[PDB]
Amino acid sequence: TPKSVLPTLLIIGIIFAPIGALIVWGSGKVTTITLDYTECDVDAPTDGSYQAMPNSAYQYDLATSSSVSESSIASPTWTFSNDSSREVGETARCEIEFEVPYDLGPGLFLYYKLTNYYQNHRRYSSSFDATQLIGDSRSLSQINGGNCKPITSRDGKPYYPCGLIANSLFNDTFPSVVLLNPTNGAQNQTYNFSESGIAWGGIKKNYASTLTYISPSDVLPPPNWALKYPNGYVDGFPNLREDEHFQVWMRVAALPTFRKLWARNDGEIMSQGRYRIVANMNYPVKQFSGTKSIVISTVSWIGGKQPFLGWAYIAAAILCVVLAVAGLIRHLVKPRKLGDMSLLSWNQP
Amino acid sequence: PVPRSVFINEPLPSEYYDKKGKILRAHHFATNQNVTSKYTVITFIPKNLFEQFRRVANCFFLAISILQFFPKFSTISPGLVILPLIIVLAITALKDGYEDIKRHQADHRTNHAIVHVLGGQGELGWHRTIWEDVKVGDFVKIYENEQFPADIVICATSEEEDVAYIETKNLDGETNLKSRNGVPGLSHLNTAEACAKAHLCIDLDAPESNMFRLNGAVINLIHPITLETTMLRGCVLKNTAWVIGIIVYTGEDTKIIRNAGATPSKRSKVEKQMNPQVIINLVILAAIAVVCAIVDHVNEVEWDRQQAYWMLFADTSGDNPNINGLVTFANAFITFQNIVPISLYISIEAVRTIQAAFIYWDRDIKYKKDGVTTRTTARSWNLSDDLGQIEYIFSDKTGTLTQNAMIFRQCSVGGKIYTHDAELDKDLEAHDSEQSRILHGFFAVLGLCHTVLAAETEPGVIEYKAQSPDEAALVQSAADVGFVFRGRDHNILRMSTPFSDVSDEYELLHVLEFNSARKRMSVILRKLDEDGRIFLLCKGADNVIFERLTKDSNQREMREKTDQDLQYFASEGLRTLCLAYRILDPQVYEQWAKEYHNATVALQDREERIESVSSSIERDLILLGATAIEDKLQDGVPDTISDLKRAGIKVWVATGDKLETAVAIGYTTNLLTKDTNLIVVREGRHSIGDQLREALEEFFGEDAGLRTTLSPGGFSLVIEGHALAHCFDDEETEALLLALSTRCNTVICCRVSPLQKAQIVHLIKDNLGVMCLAIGDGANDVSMIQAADVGVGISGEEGLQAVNSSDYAIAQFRYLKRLLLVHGHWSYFRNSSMILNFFYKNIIGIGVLFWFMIYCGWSTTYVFAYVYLLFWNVFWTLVPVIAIGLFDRNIDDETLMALPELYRASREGKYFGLMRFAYYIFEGVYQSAVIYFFLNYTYVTTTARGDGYDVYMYEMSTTQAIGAVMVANLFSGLNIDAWTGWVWFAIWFGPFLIWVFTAVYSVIPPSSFYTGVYGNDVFLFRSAAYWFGWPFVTIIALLPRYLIKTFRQNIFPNDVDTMRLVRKYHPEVDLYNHPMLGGKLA
Ligand SMILES: *[C@@H]1O[C@H](CO)[C@@H](O[C@@H]2O[C@H](CO)[C@@H](O[C@@H]3O[C@H](CO[C@H]4O[C@H](CO)[C@@H](O[C@H]5O[C@H](CO)[C@@H](O)[C@H](O)[C@@H]5O)[C@H](O)[C@@H]4O)[C@@H](O)[C@H](O[C@H]4O[C@H](CO)[C@@H](O)[C@H](O)[C@@H]4O)[C@@H]3O)[C@H](O)[C@H]2NC(C)=O)[C@H](O)[C@H]1NC(C)=O
Ligand SMILES: *[C@@H]1O[C@H](CO)[C@@H](O[C@@H]2O[C@H](CO)[C@@H](O)[C@H](O)[C@H]2NC(C)=O)[C@H](O)[C@H]1NC(C)=O
Ligand SMILES: *[C@@H]1O[C@H](CO)[C@@H](O[C@@H]2O[C@H](CO)[C@@H](O)[C@H](O)[C@H]2NC(C)=O)[C@H](O)[C@H]1NC(C)=O
Ligand SMILES: *[C@@H]1O[C@H](CO)[C@@H](O)[C@H](O)[C@H]1NC(C)=O
């Protein structure tokens, strides 16, 4: 019946349009800066100077209210340093200098983005032992028979973090974001990122701090945790509960291209100027055509700067309006009567 | 196993020869009680498991669970994964056990018939054994009015000689008699004389097939044991007191069950159409599995050549990319397990059972009369949906279209018609005239020539209790019109002509009583008058009486007048029955009497002997008149037949009356209305096939399309018995008959035979392939109901075999009309919608998983948590499907009963085919794509929340799962047009359940039940993406369905949709008397 289909579509459109507008506005009130540092090993200058990054390396997603245009932002520069005189894990530093066009509001978050990384693969998603991580006394035979099928044990010494997820922990850190030109003196000011609160305070429960049924010498570190622990666990079992990066990593991403939080700031406002972030390149991704990235983004009510749902709502509202108007026009042109007893099989001639 | 040796010494034949194991004798389980049940209590588990796992789908589920058992394919504890399969198996086992318990209780009530097998050695005692007689090594002196447990070679009898009578009713209809045993005789005394003596060696001919021939032998210390010596089975007359003889051959399951009792099983057309859809779903699952295996192997080879992080440590024998491809195949089978129907079969069976229960409890098809209240029982707990697809109905007139209680209407005596029969016979009976003498003879032959038993406990009333309705009607009418049958208490019977209580003498009742092409029922009687003359009385069918007459004197004019009177009677819709008169001289009478007496016991044939004796004694019959009894059509039969005609349902009638008297019973049953040409084929000096072809050419040969097969407002067809026999004899005649029967809507076949009726139903069902229905009460009806798609029985007065051997047991024909129309239409609609929506929801789940599998390297990883995937066919979405199966209606039953023309959609099968299946599959694919892609691109972001926490797989997975559940449930609701409470509960209890499960399951601490999703109560309910994505995906998924449904209702409506709109918007319309509706009677 037209009386039940035209008003319904009209109401649906009238409801969809404001929701889509609100979502689009909320997404617009978000800033996002993306910096690619994967190819910093071969292209960056290895002397001490700087070179402007390639155009297809950095992406700026400014807010709608910002008057600064995208093409008005100076191209970021980078440098590469590989000196084998520092601690393990900080030997290949990639320093990226980027410019923030407008003051980013409070609640600024830092993410690292990985591309072509299939955490969702079947061999990877289920490759973890929940009961070993929770710290319950699980026997060696159960570890061999657990979900940690590819990386279980060797020479009778089971791994504490087993499976493929724990073995591939992201060991790339960014322990500085410094403002190179502030206003109140202090020629360089560090924008303090806090590595606490990265993960929700409910993931730490399903990881135990110290295991009690095995001495801290019969457990071997995972194969890829060899540079961090060269001579096994000598300081005791790693405190997987107390570190947030492991908890964040051990949450299977939905898509190959995923972003995981790495340090956050809540009560500080990022000023306007050129910064310099140091990336300790230790995690190779070039082998499987992967690209790492550094994402600095602000937060709105919806979340990140993804205005897809809002524009989908707007498109649905437009389609509903078009269909409702067409139906109303058809009703006003040829108003077919209700209960028409002329199209019946025994009524039609 | 032709020979068997019996009776060495004493009963309980412990030893004959050899030891055991080869002859199957002496309680070697060669016989046992008839087993109509399925299995034993001990062996219930194996047979039940085999029957359940022969459904392909169940074996697939068991294979999936067993694969899950191994650590290579394991995800969670085996209990959770095995729970749905265990529940399905338990429900199916309980259902089949309930059906088997019903059958076993029926069999137990049938069995346990008291049997008096005596002789055991205190020395004598016990006896009165159970129906399961002791092997073939004992004897029984079975008393009067007791059923035979098995065949027997009865030696002696309580009454004079060893003569016995058994009245084979479950194997025939005629009376029965014996011809003594022979040499054993007096030497074979009963009552422990058989135990004290020890002789005879029983010999057998063929245990396999012995019907009308059970020859044998015995040798004591050679005798011709014959059928007339051997009682067969299940026959009890016992005109004597008791008969004693040894049990041989069958114990319980060798003779009569061999003769008959082959009951097939039936399945609905909807199930046979559903099987290809299950095959298609399995093929889709296999194709998905193989494509995933190939792509995953390619990607794993690529990712292991260049060491990735998810392909590390693949250099083993159970982790290399090739065995990884095989494991991907297996895990693709284990991941999309919802595509193969798991709970579809149990749900469909439950819905069909509840539909049968609705058919039972209906108060419009319940018959109340004389205290008893027959209910329309659904003997088959399936086939409830084939009633709505009936395209042909075959019926037998007597007992189904008639009340089987006929009342005398017109009686012809010589030359004057008469129209509780009182008429002018009182005013004409005035003595001293030839007409008066003929009237006296007519009434005498009507009141004596029978087998009726009269009750004199009420003087003046004298109620009569006959066996066949015709005899009761004739005798009561004769009593009411004068001559009253006083009774037959002794060998001498008495008559109550309105002058005195004169009495005749009973000598030789020719009790032939119809059947075996011998429909005469004569009886020799002698009046006690001082002359004491011997005269013969006879009544029977018109043909036999007319052919048995004389051809001299004025008898020729008498015969021609009687024939004209018979034709006039038949024209009015009456059943003809003539009467005769014969005078016997004493000498020939006594000679024939002694011949008959010595031919009664012959030990050889005696059937053709008795028939020839009967044919010889009848030589000078004199016609007396022609009775005419009208069969009362049941109340509502004409309206029922008219309504069935206004549904496209062809209504055949295989009546047992003459052609003229059964032309729609004078056009009164609405089978043959006005303005409809009728085709008559009678084989009068012409070829049946040639006549049929000529009639087809004359009436439809002008059609050009009809000539290809050969290489007035309606049409009918009449073919009585011989056209049918010759058509089924040949092939081209059968094809022409099938064509001419297809191009008509009322075929009336008169004077048919059981085999002919069964062959009619077989011809239509096989050659045409359309759904068929058969209804009747007699044994011929049980045959035609066994050989039919759907069988219906009527609890008439002719017996109860038809009700037992039928799918449905109605009590009236109007009940058939109501049942067919409303119940079949609703059942077909409900079952079609239910199956389609079940496939739709399964496809929704599988499609969301597949669209995720696009973005995972085709590694066959479930995006959802396994809890949501494991509870899809149960908990989440089964209640809407059950509600559609049970409570769904397309239009109120009043409209269906008022306008039968709406039956086109169900009759033509417009509700369930393959195009609808394809449409529902495509709709599921589209909606799953919308849900998955929209929510995925919504969650392609940094946080999707105000707290900055990352978006991981399970947040988006749970949002998509909730959206899919909402979409499936609201789709099922949108496909419901009978919203009354229960559907509301189902549609808003499914998604309510999943919402509660997500709210509570995500607060369980990791201390127990790891649950893998701890935090979704904070990551989804607090996120604007979830709250603005699930309604968006629901609306967008349901919008095309809503628009298509509205446009199909408005732009291109159906008859049912138009009538629904008319009823809803115009309640003040008289459907029965409206010019553009049933008032037009169209
Ligand atoms: C940040 O993280 C990254 C990755 O998350 C770290 O990079 C990894 O660091 C590991 C530790 O040093 C490396 O593992 C070692 O690799 C060497 C040599 O590599 C090759 O060795 C073999 C060829 O000779 C062969 O090894 C197998 O590799 C696969 C499993 O590892 C198998 O499927 C395959 O079939 C081979 O059989 C490969 O070709 C390797 O490419 C090995 O010799 C080392 O073995 C030693 O240690 C293991 C520990 O369990 C022990 O059993 C052995 O007996 C032996 O003593 C070891 O495997 C890894 O290669 C490397 N990966 C990448 C991509 O760089 C990075 O170091 C880290 N950085 C920081 C600062 O934290
Ligand atoms: C920093 O320098 C060190 C040593 O110069 C590099 O380590 C070598 O990297 C090459 C890469 O092909 C390997 O083949 C060698 O086995 C590594 N070790 C040695 C001792 O040569 C390291 O890769 C450099 N960091 C980069 C390029 O990011
Ligand atoms: C990051 O933290 C440092 C130290 O906690 C802050 O540096 C201080 O800045 C104030 C304001 O200019 C000075 O008065 C202090 O003397 C500084 N202390 C030190 C130790 O340098 C810095 O301002 C913080 N950055 C931001 C963006 O808030
Ligand atoms: C920051 O400035 C101080 C002194 O101005 C200098 O010693 C230090 O190296 C600087 N750090 C940088 C440039 O990262």
Ligand SMILES: [Mg+2]
């Ligand atoms: Mg009948």
